[PDB]
Design a protein around this motif. Structure first.
Motif, short mmCIF file in Angstrom:
data_model
loop_
_atom_site.label_atom_id
_atom_site.label_comp_id
_atom_site.label_asym_id
_atom_site.label_seq_id
_atom_site.Cartn_x
_atom_site.Cartn_y
_atom_site.Cartn_z
N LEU A 51 2.02 6.55 -5.82
CA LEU A 51 1.83 6.06 -7.17
C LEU A 51 0.85 6.96 -7.92
CD1 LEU A 51 1.52 2.21 -6.51
CD2 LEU A 51 3.58 3.60 -6.78
N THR A 52 1.25 7.42 -9.10
CA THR A 52 0.39 8.27 -9.90
C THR A 52 -0.81 7.48 -10.42
OG1 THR A 52 1.60 7.84 -11.95
CG2 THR A 52 2.37 9.66 -10.56
N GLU A 53 -1.76 8.21 -11.02
CA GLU A 53 -2.94 7.56 -11.57
C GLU A 53 -2.58 6.68 -12.76
OE1 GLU A 53 -5.64 10.71 -12.46
OE2 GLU A 53 -6.08 11.15 -10.36
N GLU A 54 -1.65 7.14 -13.60
CA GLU A 54 -1.25 6.35 -14.76
C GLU A 54 -0.40 5.16 -14.35
OE1 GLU A 54 0.29 10.03 -15.04
OE2 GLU A 54 -1.83 10.14 -14.48
N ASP A 109 0.81 -1.21 0.00
CA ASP A 109 0.00 0.00 0.00
C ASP A 109 0.84 1.26 0.00
OD1 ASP A 109 0.90 -0.59 2.60
OD2 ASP A 109 -0.68 0.64 3.49
N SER A 110 2.04 1.22 0.59
CA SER A 110 2.97 2.34 0.62
C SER A 110 4.27 1.88 -0.03
CB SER A 110 3.20 2.83 2.05
OG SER A 110 4.06 3.95 2.06
N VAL A 122 6.67 -0.72 -18.58
CA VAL A 122 7.25 -0.13 -17.37
C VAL A 122 7.45 1.36 -17.58
CG1 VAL A 122 8.33 -2.23 -16.49
CG2 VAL A 122 9.51 -0.85 -18.21
N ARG A 123 6.75 1.93 -18.56
CA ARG A 123 6.93 3.34 -18.89
C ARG A 123 6.41 4.24 -17.77
NH1 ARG A 123 4.77 3.17 -25.21
NH2 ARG A 123 6.19 1.53 -25.93
N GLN A 124 5.17 4.02 -17.34
CA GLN A 124 4.58 4.89 -16.33
C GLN A 124 5.20 4.68 -14.96
OE1 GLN A 124 2.58 7.42 -16.79
NE2 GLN A 124 2.46 7.05 -19.00
N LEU A 125 5.72 3.48 -14.68
CA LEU A 125 6.37 3.23 -13.40
C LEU A 125 7.77 3.83 -13.36
CD1 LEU A 125 5.29 -0.39 -12.38
CD2 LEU A 125 4.60 1.80 -11.38
N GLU A 159 -0.75 3.47 -11.33
CA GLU A 159 -1.61 2.50 -10.67
C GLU A 159 -2.34 1.62 -11.68
OE1 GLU A 159 -2.55 1.18 -7.95
OE2 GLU A 159 -1.75 2.37 -6.29
N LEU A 160 -2.64 2.15 -12.86
CA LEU A 160 -3.30 1.35 -13.89
C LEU A 160 -2.31 0.44 -14.60
CD1 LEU A 160 -5.72 4.03 -15.39
CD2 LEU A 160 -6.11 2.38 -13.54
N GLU A 161 -1.07 0.90 -14.78
CA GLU A 161 -0.05 0.04 -15.38
C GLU A 161 0.30 -1.12 -14.46
OE1 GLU A 161 3.95 1.56 -15.80
OE2 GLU A 161 3.99 1.00 -17.92
N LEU A 162 0.18 -0.93 -13.15
CA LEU A 162 0.45 -2.01 -12.21
C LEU A 162 -0.70 -3.01 -12.17
CD1 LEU A 162 2.30 -3.20 -10.00
CD2 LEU A 162 1.05 -1.79 -8.35
#
Lengths: 411, 555
Positions: free
Chosen positions: A278-281, A233-234, A259-262, A283-286
DNA sequence: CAGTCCCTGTTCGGGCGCCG
DNA sequence: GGTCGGCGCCCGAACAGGGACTG
């Protein structure tokens, strides 16, 4: 009064010439008694130095077994007769054996001693028995009957074996029987009680023809080890760096991993222990990368012409992972073993146990033994592995030195 | 020709070739007399027969003096016959050792005179053993014989005699089970716990059982009183020792003199504890000529004087007692050298030895200690058939930390800790989690294949930075240099991030010695630290400062 | 994309010791 | 000029297999 099936080596290959390794006292004593008894029964006969071929020999004890068992490392002889037990008289592999609820193994190697061996081929079954402190020179023998642990033995005995199992396969058409080396795999969906009962029926059915233990398996309960990402979570800078490195390695198997957004979260020269939201973009890539790891790899299937390969990774705390494949990153099966014999005290015993469990699964699923990549130094393995072997077959192996990358197969 | 009582061994040639056809060497007139004297004697006893022109085969022959005797030995140069004779499987798997013998009441040693010449050769193979004996005149056509027994110089002669000898001894050893007969070529160590009265009877029974097959046991080589000379040792009723070793005392040493010195030092190390041949073996590296004179280094002269002092005092070993346990204790000698002693009672050594092999470019004492344990284990199973109990100069907790965290499978048999400095330990431990409140160094390094020039540096989270130009370097050496920089410019606790698998694979193995001077400096800096956390990230992925420092060290 | 090269490990040829 | 087999050690050269970079 039995006719011998003619057997030849593969064209352009000589016989095996492998030196005999040192044996312990309890092993040498157990081999002299067995060989003298087998010599009295005409199974083997002494030879001389004019035979340039030799195959190593040692002894084992199966699981919960008091009686010693002679074992010959025919791996080199089997490589030089490969065209016989495949092109000529192979054994079909039932694809339903791996689906049964319970599968039992029976050591039927004693039956091969009833069939004589081709006279011209006995020259290659030669083996030497060593002595402690080299008191006496090598006491060499050769086989006069079908040797245990030779892949040509179940091929020649296959015709005789089918005629013995015919009265039993008729009364039980729903039971699958597979023969591999000195072992007979009998699988059924019956309840555990009446299953062992049908085994005893087959035991007495084999005793009346001239043939006693039992190892139970459950292939329907065999599980695989998928690649999993942590549910944190963190996230800190170090966690995201470990996650990206793992997703970068996993991308060689699932090409849909990004792995671009991460990596965008690792732009600044931040401290490893610093917490990063974690950004919004990202969190979706994960979440999307977690779903691709649930999907099966595209275009993976077993090729019967290709050899199986097994890699084993030491995960510590008595944990061992493995992957079976024919082409790299096209894993046919993955898994993880835990709490084996010797856990938290002996790595070599655990590694030996793992290889045997993996090879057993490779025989039930595909009917082949893999070539192992062992995470161990060669001299360490070649010193201790015979002290823990409990199987009648011996797979092939090589030794690898791969320092841990990004712990891909275990959290 | 009469038939020998011993069964013959069928011998063939390689498919597609025929017998040897080589011309005789010009022999000295003193060796011609020694050959014709023996050839006419062996012909009388049925060991060689004349051959006419129907034998188109010929092979050289010469003679070599016997040690401490006026008799000569007949040797045949069968190098052309051996390259065409079938391959044999040698039954001599090893050499017996006196430490493996057990205490016996009565012991007898005897040697068979002319063993090869008392064992027959195959009938269909005698045609290929054709040679010529040059007369005193070069115009004389000479006499041509062929062997009827096992020649000396043929590659099948030793294996055949060893197998033929074992078949003759089996009926005797089957009737006399409690008689220990060590068989090595023609030497027969015979021992028994029987009374000294019945012992000599059994010996004469064996001397008559062997006589029934053409094997003579002369009373000259017969030994009835200790000390027995057997396999180059001196067997006493309670101890043993090697026969006296003579080291050369050359004032000017050549390369071949060192090999003869190193060879005898290894032979002495089996009972003389503490022999070191590290600095003496450093004289053999990079040399090309066997006769090249080489001076002794200061470290080599000191190592030679220490080995000579050890050989001054008399040492001895005991025999194996199967009733009591087997103990092996190792010591860390020099940098890369280990010595061990195997014993059952304190200070009563069965045998000693040394292990000093350098496996790999990067290693530590725990790796070398494990290698030595394995070498002792295999050696112990050869001699006694069991694995000894180990007393190792390494803490129990030290080893537990190593093998549990290592990625390779590793294990040591049943052992116990002995407190004998120097102790084997791990000189530094890499943390498993990033250190809170430690500066984070993002290192990188690159080079050019052509210019052999490169940069190496780092960027930290506190803004700290450094780049260093490097000349005559590679991509790998720069990535190690970038980590060496981060260790130098950091405090006692430091997190280091790299994209180099090569550098990370070296440091995680916890080496304490290396063949690379840069690695040894990285080791020395890691020992000075309190907490070090390494980490790997993929390159060219725009990760943290690892992309910023990749662009700085680009050129 | 296949081509190198930097690196490391293994295997084997050859010298000596020792024995028969 | 110099024979065979076995075991042990020491060395360098040749073999070889994997990782990062480049046309």
């Amino acid at each position: 009064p039995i006719e011998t099936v003619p057997v030849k080596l593969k064209p352009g290959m000589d016989g095996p010439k492998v030196k005999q390794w040192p044996l312990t006292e309890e092993k040498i004593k157990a081999l002299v008694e067995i060989c003298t008894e087998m010599e009295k029964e005409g199974k083997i006969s002494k030879i001389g130095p004019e035979n340039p071929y030799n195959t190593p020999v040692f002894a084992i004890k199966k699981k919960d077994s008091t009686k010693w068992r002679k074992l010959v490392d025919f791996r080199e002889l089997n490589k030089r007769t490969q065209d016989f037990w495949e092109v000529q008289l192979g054994i079909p592999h039932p694809a339903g054996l791996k689906k049964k609820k319970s599968v039992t193994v029976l050591d039927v190697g004693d039956a091969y001693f009833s069939v004589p061996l081709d006279e011209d081929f006995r020259k290659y079954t030669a083996f030497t028995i060593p002595s402690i402190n080299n008191e006496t020179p090598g006491i060499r023998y050769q086989y006069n009957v079908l040797p245990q642990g030779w892949k040509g033995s179940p091929a020649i005995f296959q015709s005789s074996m089918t005629k013995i199992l015919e009265p039993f396969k008729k009364q039980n058409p729903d039971i699958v029987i597979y023969q591999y080396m000195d072992d007979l795999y009998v699988g059924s969906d019956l309840e555990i009680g009446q299953h062992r009962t049908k085994i005893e029926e087959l035991r007495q059915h084999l005793l009346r023809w001239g043939l006693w233990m039992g190892y139970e398996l459950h292939p329907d309960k065999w599980t695989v080890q998928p690649i999993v990402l942590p549910e944190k979570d963190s996230w800190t800078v170090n966690d995201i760096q470990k996650l990206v490195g793992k997703l970068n390695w996993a991308s060689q198997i699932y090409p849909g991993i990004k792995v671009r957004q991460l990596s965008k979260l690792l732009r600044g020269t931040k401290a490893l222990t610093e917490v990063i939201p974690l950004t919004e973009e990202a969190e979706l890539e994960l979440a999307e990368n977690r779903e691709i790891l649930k999907e099966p790899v595209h275009g993976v299937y077993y090729d019967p012409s290709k050899d199986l390969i097994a890699e084993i990774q030491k995960q510590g705390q008595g944990q061992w992972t493995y992957q079976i494949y024919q082409e790299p990153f096209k894993n046919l099966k993955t898994g993880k073993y835990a709490r084996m014999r010797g856990a938290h005290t002996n790595d070599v015993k655990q590694l030996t146990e793992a290889v045997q469990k993996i090879t057993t699964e490779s025989i039930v699923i595909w009917g082949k033994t893999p070539k192992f990549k062992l995470p161990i130094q060669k001299e360490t393995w070649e010193t201790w592995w015979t002290e823990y072997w409990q199987a009648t077959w011996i797979p092939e192996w090589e030794f690898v030195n791969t320092p841990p990358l990004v712990k891909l197969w275990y959290q | 020709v009469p038939i020998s009582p011993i069964e013959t061994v069928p011998v063939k040639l390689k498919p597609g070739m025929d017998g040897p056809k080589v011309k005789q060497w010009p022999l000295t007139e003193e060796k011609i007399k020694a050959l014709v004297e023996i050839c006419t004697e062996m012909e009388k006893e049925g060991k060689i027969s004349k051959i006419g022109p129907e034998n188109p085969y010929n092979t050289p022959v010469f003679a070599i003096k016997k040690k401490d005797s006026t008799k000569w030995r007949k040797l045949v140069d069968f190098r052309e016959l051996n390259k065409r004779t079938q391959d044999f499987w040698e039954v001599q798997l090893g050499i017996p050792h006196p430490a493996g013998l057990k205490k016996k009441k009565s012991v007898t040693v005897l040697d068979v005179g002319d063993a090869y010449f008392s064992v027959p050769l195959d009938e269909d193979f005698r045609k290929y053993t054709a040679f010529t004996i040059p007369s005193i005149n070069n115009e004389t056509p000479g006499i041509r014989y062929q062997y009827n027994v096992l020649p000396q110089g043929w590659k099948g002669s030793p294996a055949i005699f060893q197998s033929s000898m074992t078949k003759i001894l089996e009926p005797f050893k089957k009737q006399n089970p409690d008689i220990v007969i060590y068989q090595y070529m023609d030497d027969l160590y015979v021992g028994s716990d029987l009374e000294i009265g019945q012992h000599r009877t059994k010996i004469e029974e064996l001397r008559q059982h062997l006589l029934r097959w053409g094997l003579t046991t002369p009373d000259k080589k017969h030994q009835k009183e200790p000390p027995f000379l057997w396999m180059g040792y001196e067997l006493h009723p309670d101890k043993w020792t090697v026969q006296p070793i003579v080291l050369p005392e050359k004032d000017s040493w050549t390369v071949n003199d060192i090999c003869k010195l190193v060879g005898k030092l290894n032979w002495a190390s089996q009972i003389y504890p503490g022999i070191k041949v590290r600095q003496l073996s450093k004289l053999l590296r990079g040399t090309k000529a066997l006769t090249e004179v080489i001076p002794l280094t200061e470290e080599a002269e000191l190592e030679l004087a220490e080995n000579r002092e050890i050989l001054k005092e008399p040492v001895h070993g005991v025999y194996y007692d199967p009733s009591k346990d087997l103990i092996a204790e190792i010591q860390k000698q020099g940098q890369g050298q280990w010595t061990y002693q195997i014993y059952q009672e304190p200070f009563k050594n069965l045998k000693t030895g040394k292990y000093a092999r350098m496996r790999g470019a990067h290693t530590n004492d725990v790796k070398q200690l494990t290698e030595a344990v394995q070498k002792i284990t295999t050696e112990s199973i050869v001699i006694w058939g069991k694995t000894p109990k180990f007393k190792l100069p390494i803490q129990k907790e030290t080893w537990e930390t190593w093998w549990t965290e290592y990625w390779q499978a590793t294990w040591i048999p049943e052992w116990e800790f002995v407190n004998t400095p120097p102790l084997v330990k791990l000189w530094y431990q890499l943390e498993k989690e990033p250190i809170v409140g430690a500066e984070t160094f993002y290192v990188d390094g690159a080079a050019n294949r052509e210019t052999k020039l490169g940069k190496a540096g780092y960027v930290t989270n506190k803004g700290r930075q450094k780049v260093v130009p490097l000349t005559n370097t590679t991509n790998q050496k720069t990535e190690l240099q970038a980590i060496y920089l981060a260790l130098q410019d950091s405090g006692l606790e430091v997190n280091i991030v790299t994209n180099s698998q090569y550098a990370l694979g070296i440091i995680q193995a916890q080496p304490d010695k290396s063949e690379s001077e840069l690695v040894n400096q990285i080791i020395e800096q890691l020992i000075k630290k309190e907490k070090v956390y390494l980490a790997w990230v993929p390159a060219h992925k725009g990760i943290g400062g690892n992309e910023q420092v990749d662009k700085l060290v680009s050129a």
